[PDB]
Paper text:
The Dbf4-dependent kinase Cdc7 (DDK) regulates DNA replication initiation by phosphorylation of the MCM double hexamer (MCM-DH) to promote helicase activation. At early G1 phase, when the DDK (Dbf4-dependent Cdc7 kinase) and S-CDK (S-cyclin dependent kinase) kinase activities are low, the origin recognition complex (ORC) together with Cdc6 and Cdt1 load the Mcm2-7 helicases onto origin DNA to form an inactive MCM double hexamer (DH) encircling dsDNA to license replication. During this process, DDK and S-CDK, act in concert with various origin-firing factors to convert the DH into two active Cdc45-Mcm2-7-GINS (CMG) helicases which then serve as scaffolds for the assembly of bidirectional replisomes. Compelling evidence in budding yeast has also shown that the essential role of DDK in DNA replication is to relieve an inhibitory effect imposed on replication initiation from the N-terminal serine/threonine-rich domain (NSD) of Mcm4 (residues 74-174), as NSD deletion can bypass DDK function.
In the map produced from particles of the first subset, both Dbf4 and Cdc7 are stably attached to the DH (State I), whereas in the second subset only the N-terminal half of Dbf4 is visible in the derived maps. The final density map of State I has a global resolution of 2.9 Å with most residues at the DH-DDK interfaces clearly resolved. A striking feature of the DH-DDK structure is that Cdc7 has almost no physical contact with the DH. Instead, the association of DDK with the DH is mediated exclusively by Dbf4 through multiple contacts with the NTD-A subdomains (NTD-As) of three MCM subunits, Mcm4, Mcm6 and Mcm2’ from the opposite hexamer. In State I, the kinase core makes an intimate contact with the Mcm4-NTD-A via motif C of Dbf4. Motif C of Dbf4 mediates the attachment of the kinase core to the NTD-A of Mcm4 so that the active center of Cdc7 is oriented towards Mcm4 for the capture of Mcm4-NSD with a higher probability than the other nearby substrates. In State I of the DH-DDK, the regulatory loop (residues 504–519) of Dbf4, which is upstream of the M4NB, is embedded in the substrate binding site of Cdc7. The N-terminal residue of this loop, Thr506, is situated close to the γ-phosphate of the ATP-γ-S nucleotide in the active center of Cdc7. In the DH-DDK structure from the ATP-γ-S treated sample, upon DDK binding, Mcm4-NSD becomes flexible and completely invisible. Instead, the M4NB of Dbf4 (residues 520-534) associates with the Mcm4-NTD-A by displacing Mcm4-NSD from its binding site in the free DH, suggesting that the M4NB and Mcm4-NSD compete for the same binding surface on Mcm4.
Numbering used by the authors:
A (entry chain 7): 189 to 564
B (entry chain 4): 176 to 733, 739 to 784, 788 to 853
C (entry chain E): 2 to 110, 129 to 223, 233 to 291
D (entry chain I): 511 to 534, 657 to 703
E (entry chain 6): 101 to 199, 260 to 433, 441 to 467, 498 to 763
Amino acid sequence: TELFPPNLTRRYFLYFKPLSQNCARRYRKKAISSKPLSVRQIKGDFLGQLITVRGIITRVSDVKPAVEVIAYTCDQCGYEVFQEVNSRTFTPLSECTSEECSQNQTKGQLFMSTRASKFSAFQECKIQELSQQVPVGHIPRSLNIHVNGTLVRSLSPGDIVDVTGIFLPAPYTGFKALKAGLLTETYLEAQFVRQHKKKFASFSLTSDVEERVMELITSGDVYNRLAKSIAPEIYGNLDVKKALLLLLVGGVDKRVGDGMKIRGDINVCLMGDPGVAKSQLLKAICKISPRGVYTTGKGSSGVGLTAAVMKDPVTDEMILEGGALVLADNGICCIDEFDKMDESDRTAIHEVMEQQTISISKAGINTTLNARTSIL
Amino acid sequence: PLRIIWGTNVSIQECTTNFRNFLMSFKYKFRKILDEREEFINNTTDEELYYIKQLNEMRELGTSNLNLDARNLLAYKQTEDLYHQLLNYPQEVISIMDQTIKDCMVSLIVDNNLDYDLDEIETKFYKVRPYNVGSCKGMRELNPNDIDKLINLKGLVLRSTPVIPDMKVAFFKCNVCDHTMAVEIDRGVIQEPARCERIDCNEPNSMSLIHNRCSFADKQVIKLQETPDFVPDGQTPHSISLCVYDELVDSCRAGDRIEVTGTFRSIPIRANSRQRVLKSLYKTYVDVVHVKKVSDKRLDVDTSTIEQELMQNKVDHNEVEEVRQITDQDLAKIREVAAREDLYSLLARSIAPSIYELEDVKKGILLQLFGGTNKTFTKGGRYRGDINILLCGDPSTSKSQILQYVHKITPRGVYTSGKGSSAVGLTAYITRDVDTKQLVLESGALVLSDGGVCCIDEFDKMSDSTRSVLHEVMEQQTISIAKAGIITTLNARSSILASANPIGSRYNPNLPVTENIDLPPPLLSRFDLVYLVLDKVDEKNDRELAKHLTNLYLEDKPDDVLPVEFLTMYISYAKEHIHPIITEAAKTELVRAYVGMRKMGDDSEKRITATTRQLESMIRLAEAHAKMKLKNVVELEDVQEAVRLIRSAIKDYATDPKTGKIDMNLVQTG
Amino acid sequence: SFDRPEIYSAPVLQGESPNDDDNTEIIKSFKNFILEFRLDSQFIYRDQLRNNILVKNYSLTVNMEHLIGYNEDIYKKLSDEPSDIIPLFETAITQVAKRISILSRAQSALNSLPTFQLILNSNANQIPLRDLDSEHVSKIVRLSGIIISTSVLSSRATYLSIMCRNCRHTTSITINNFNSITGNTVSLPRSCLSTIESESSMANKKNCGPDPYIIIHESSKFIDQQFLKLQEIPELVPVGEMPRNLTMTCDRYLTNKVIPGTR
Amino acid sequence: GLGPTRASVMSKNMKSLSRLMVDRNSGYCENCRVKYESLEQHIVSEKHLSFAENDLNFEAIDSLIENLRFQ
Amino acid sequence: KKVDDVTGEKVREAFEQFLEDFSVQSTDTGEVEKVYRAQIEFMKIYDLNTIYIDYQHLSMRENGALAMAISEQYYRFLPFLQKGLRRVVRKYAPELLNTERVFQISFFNLPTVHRIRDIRSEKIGSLLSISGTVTRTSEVRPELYKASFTCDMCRAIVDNVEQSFKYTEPTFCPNPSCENRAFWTLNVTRSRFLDWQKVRIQENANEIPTGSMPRTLDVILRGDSVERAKPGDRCKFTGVEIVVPDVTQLGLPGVKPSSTLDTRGISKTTEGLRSLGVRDLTYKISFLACHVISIGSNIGERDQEVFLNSLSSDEINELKEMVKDEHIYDKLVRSIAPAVFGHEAVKKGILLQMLGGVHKSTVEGIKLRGDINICVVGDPSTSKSQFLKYVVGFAPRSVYTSGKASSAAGLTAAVVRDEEGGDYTIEAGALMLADNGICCIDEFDKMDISDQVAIHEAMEQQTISIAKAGIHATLNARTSILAAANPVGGRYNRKLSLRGNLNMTAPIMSRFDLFFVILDDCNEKIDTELASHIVDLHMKRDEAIEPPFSAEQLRRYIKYARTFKP
Ligand SMILES: Nc1ncnc2c1ncn2[C@@H]1O[C@H](COP(=O)(O)OP(=O)(O)OP(O)(O)=S)[C@@H](O)[C@H]1O
Ligand SMILES: Nc1ncnc2c1ncn2[C@@H]1O[C@H](COP(=O)(O)OP(=O)(O)OP(O)(O)=S)[C@@H](O)[C@H]1O
Ligand SMILES: Nc1ncnc2c1ncn2[C@@H]1O[C@H](COP(=O)(O)OP(=O)(O)OP(O)(O)=S)[C@@H](O)[C@H]1O
Ligand SMILES: [Mg+2]
Ligand SMILES: [Mg+2]
Ligand SMILES: [Mg+2]
Ligand SMILES: [Zn+2]
Ligand SMILES: [Zn+2]
Ligand SMILES: [Zn+2]
Ligand SMILES: [Zn+2]
Ligand SMILES: [Zn+2]
């Protein structure tokens, strides 16, 4: 008999969680999978191994259906013919390869059946090593992360992340004249994702969280305790740190049935003499916040804050990529050196602090984009 | 036993019987019970068989389409399974629905013995359009397991490709004996004949395809800018491609907010033109089943802008509805509201209930929503009753919220910010299509706003080069492009609603009005109303303002004000069926007011001089006031109210005619 | 560095209605003929196949009159077009024989079962060697005579493994037709098959050349083939005319069954 | 067993679905023009009970009843 | 034997009876003249190629079956009509047979005129009438009509091969010397060609929907219809909706139809040593017109003799009556821009601009401009744009442009690329779309400096130079300019000169003959009269407009007066 193979009957996706460093310390095990590497440290000797990379996510593609096996129907014999796909491109089948058609003189014609075929939710992400991992005088490089199955939408741009996956080679992409032998591209088939900063929307009232929360409540004076611990090595500025804590928490977003909205986020300005450690406060606040962005006033231009229209080649479509006010959406945008900015960024932030959107009407796009940033 | 289609859980017999029972035995009171609305059940409409009378009027009118609400399937007990089968397997369940609709059309005259012939009905191909299939989850939150499911989406149309012929029947001709055959398309593939079908002529490769004899069908591709209800953290908006077929072609225009329900599809794309090699990553699109262009939350589209489009809708039998159907009961309700003595204050109060006071501002917004009358000269001229309003004022005067409300209430406006917009981005531009890799035309903000209101926030921050585009829009309601690929006049009959601050970011009484506004004279004169909305510090005004913004926070979900649905349908009816005209009594008032303002402008720039455009603004405002009260003629009191609104907008009573300055404590009443 | 994608099939729908001239239906009818034929009270062909499996004789002997008795349509298809129908009946024998072999050695306590040979005999009218005409070409003929010479056993190739000279591409050619003479109806491919197959994702202009395959003889399989010369009966020959003869080719279990001089 | 009347001609998509089918008291009410799984469930249904309480569709019957009362 | 088309032959019979039977009554006398035999006789003495058939004449036959057959299946029945016309002209005027002469049937007076966006796929291969504005005209090119081939190995010549759209080679090879069909070689000298033009048309500005951009269509003219359409005019094309292969639909979403070879009756053997031909079915709608007529670009030839020959007796009598009037100049001034009150000097200037001066060339070679360029400057809301609206809605060969919506290429000429190919084409700019007309440019002040430079160059030499890409061209742009400008600072400063009030450069200013500074003065009488005029306009529309002359008689007088060279 020819049965449907097991591969066409899985409803589950299987992933590898790396061993924790503490459990390795208990049991005298030394594993290469547990230790976070940088992109520079991931060499050709790690191919095929389950390894963990630490870094920032810079690019996330849209979720697309990548076909793993293609299903065809034959009207001549009634069989379903499945051809596997393990490459970026494939050639479709025309004549039926089932036993009944293979033996028969007349060959049937195969038609694609997209409901009977197997797809994976596919995303390609770019990971870049942190500034603490870049050596002296070097430019950060990038690594490609392949996300398939359930793990999609677990990576977003601007996330410090430990990604554990299988380091696998791919066919060479580049000029044919520059290759020497069997050159291969590289990627990381993602198996596990650990966020350094957990998202506020991802918070769940689990059992283990409750005793820590109740311990902090029973310790008392949580307002003053959380205020003065924001930047413990910055002396004084108790009320400044209190309003920075209120910046981190924020108020209640209000919606009325008429349709108008009142924002709940708080915007805080620190204007002061030089040497009052306000840049240290900005660094501390949007290092504490899970979705914080630090920005120097002339370091970001008008296109570097609102939006830019550019092409994604993996999904092959012309997409809008936001600036710092998009990367800090549902977070805090740290805008250092506020008084030395241009009028373009001032107008963009001027619209952001009230309507929480940016409207772009240019030669490329006519759109509005959500930016619910709290601005420091 | 019972047969099931492979890959599904769908039985043709079971689904046919269930949907037939649903069509024969549905009442809209079931929808009332399902939506937890018991007190709104009425005897005369809910207890009538809904789809029976809808299929009857479908028979009388020659309509071949049934618009089916999927929530109604959940209202009925027996079709609650079928609802899921409509969402999971639209491709065959829709065909089952079409077949049983045809059966029901036969049955309604077979059983009841009507005089209609069966041949015309059974020749017709009835098809169903399901809509309201569920929650509007985003495109980017969908998964490959959602392929070939019914999905509902919000969006704005950016552009549409021309009519594309997709080939349904193929016509092959023999070269030597001129014998022809016609072959049907089968799942996108046409079998070309290797040998001639004739017994006498069997020559190989003698069949050639004649491209003009073979039959085609309409296919159009529309680029839709999606506006999800929920947007994840840092999600930047995208454009989808949606394919409409047959009747639905050219039913969506560029710049309209629509409700697309369709099928989630995925196809592989060829990597090269010469090769048949396909890409493993698939391209997703929506195969559109039904388009809803009407929301009860917002106004209907202006009928004066789509007259030939409505005629083409009638010709093509696309029969997608553009305006709300007004019944008799709600029409009588519209008249009894229109006869109320305080109708003007009632309608102005019902504009923005969350915005406190600004009564004259709301009255002007109401009159801009109504609009003046549109007059088409037989010689060829055209006058458009579009009211332009500038709101200049101190910060935090709820004016940006007024722009947000107007943007939500208008059918096809565009919200823009000062200097976040460019001159090219307001009119038209050349873009690169991702699909065809071709240079395509795409409409700017002002052209996309035709038939609606263009809201421009921070009008003072806009650069003068960008600001120069608006002149032709406010004077002729057109934009005349002479660029590299475009030499044409585009209709932009959009009402400009702008917001601005003074130079010092706060109004200065020591400075005059014109210096405070900081707009050039050929620009400011095009505005029908200029509102100086100032923040005066009072006891009672601050107390009531604080109470108004503070009662909003009493509960999580917060006189007499009309509901937004009734307000929208009232304004839609008044715009569609009421065209007031000027009488001689109104003419005398208009002329006397214009000469009075010109005489007042004689005194010695520092003050806003009277303008011919101010006479035209008075005419348009009086026409909008007459259109409000459902009068077909403009009386004298309409002109007096227009003059009062114009004078109170700029606060002419407060200002000194000589110096041009405005006092605060003396004349102004908060 | 990915693997070759594999293609598999699974029967779901009924498909188009079967036709009698289809190869699958001919194979099924032949299989039912083998399994269901009774001479007096016994399945003679089923028992013969089992006994031949026990003695490692991978062939079946079938009488042609039994095919007349069972189904005339497959009989006339076999008679008119033997080179298309004989491999189908051999495939039917092999499908029955694998089923018999698996159920035999696992109950009466790796194994490769080759394609079975069709030997078919009949008692129909024997046309003489002088009345062979062009109407008998590619037809099954019954004809009598005497045997003059039997040739030595030549070795024909059934299963042969080939390897490319420099490309190192490994391929296998299976042959089930050895009964042709003076010509290679199956030959090694003219060019390397690694390019057209595209089995490797990397796909490492490189051409391997004309006829680049060599036969790995240690992993190839062979059968025996013999040439016989059949003369007409010298008792019935015209006085002034030389007797006429034919060359015959036999293979597999038909070889070494006769000696020269037998009738 | 009256059954419900149906259209003469079937659709091409409907005929295409016949090739895709595999395997996994009752009657028809002409008053409500629906099939029912059981009669006693069709008796307790909003359309049948709403049809029963209405008397304007048995008017001819009513006239006949009146005539047959005074024969 | 070939199979015949019974309905096609009866359409041929009905058409050849129509060509000899149809007749109308004479207007002047009442005689019965058969107009199509007269048309054939007219073609006989001038050796014409095209026969013009009115569609209303064809609709009168039978109950309308023949006209409906021609309308729905024009592509199928066109060769049958051609051979029917061939038979009729053979019976009547055989001299047209010899020169074989190709004939073209042009249909006109179709009952309905379709928009560009109303074109649907159900009308492919059907007779149609559309309208549009011509933007690009290609040059006349030969099209392979009757190809003559020579076989590669038999090497005998064969001629008169049918050519239908895509290039085809015969597979008959009637000589019995060789045995293959596919291999042939074209003889371009011996083969026959027809004229061919691809003119691109755009949706008319009144027909564009509310938010959408105009969409274009490539209509192809053949034979005598070639070069009957000019860049920038409104033409009504009657023809057939055809379909043309398009390759750019590969990336489009949806199932693209494809064609593969059916293999069911082909015997095969697995001898060994599996390729098939599959080809895409992707297309775009095009048009093939047999009749081109140019309706006026207005809402409603230099020699005078040809103009007065065109007019009939009644309108030439009306023109003579207009000429004879002694107060004609005042009536001409009062008839210009009736919606505008006052500003008689601007109306005089507009009239003189629409008339213009003579063009003179000296013996040295320099050209003296006869075109009058007028700039209207003044205070806001002085009806300075109403004049431009009147000139564009009235004057022939007039275009309207805004200052900021302008461009250097859009006003003069553009070098453009189609389908990302190696071919570069020329878009005619606004100055050439108004050639021997008026280019009306509102907000000349808001125009940037580069476009002002590119337009005063075309005011200097009255020509346009192109050197972009591989295209070097000299283009004719002799055009009067009606500019509207606002002063710097908004209002007009009386204390400053005209140069100080305007940012328009000195080369721009030096070539404007008239500078009309129209100003607002506040006095009760004229403000009251102007307000009364405007409210009467709003009340009465066309009833409030009572000019001395209507637009059509004004245009006839202007076109008559432009023939004079004072
Ligand atoms: N209150 C403070 N407590 C501790 N360290 C401080 C304090 N104020 C200043 N410093 C130190 O002085 C330096 C201040 O650096 P910054 O953060 O750049 O201050 P600043 O206010 O941002 O200066 P700018 O850029 O001119 S506004 C750091 O080295 C701080 O550690
Ligand atoms: N009179 C009012 N009625 C209701 N809400 C008000 C009023 N005045 C201020 N607000 C609210 O106060 C906030 C101020 O934002 P906006 O008034 O929208 O800003 P703005 O008036 O446009 O002035 P800008 O942004 O500086 S140009 C909003 O949440 C308003 O809803
Ligand atoms: N003198 C006038 N005679 C007739 N109509 C006038 C006059 N002045 C103004 N109008 C009318 O008032 C309106 C003025 O519109 P426009 O002609 O666009 O103003 P404008 O003269 O172009 O000034 P700018 O430069 O555009 S601000 C139009 O409806 C005119 O018909
Ligand atoms: Mg600092
Ligand atoms: Mg604001
Ligand atoms: Mg103007
Ligand atoms: Zn098959
Ligand atoms: Zn033929
Ligand atoms: Zn090789
Ligand atoms: Zn019932
Ligand atoms: Zn030849």
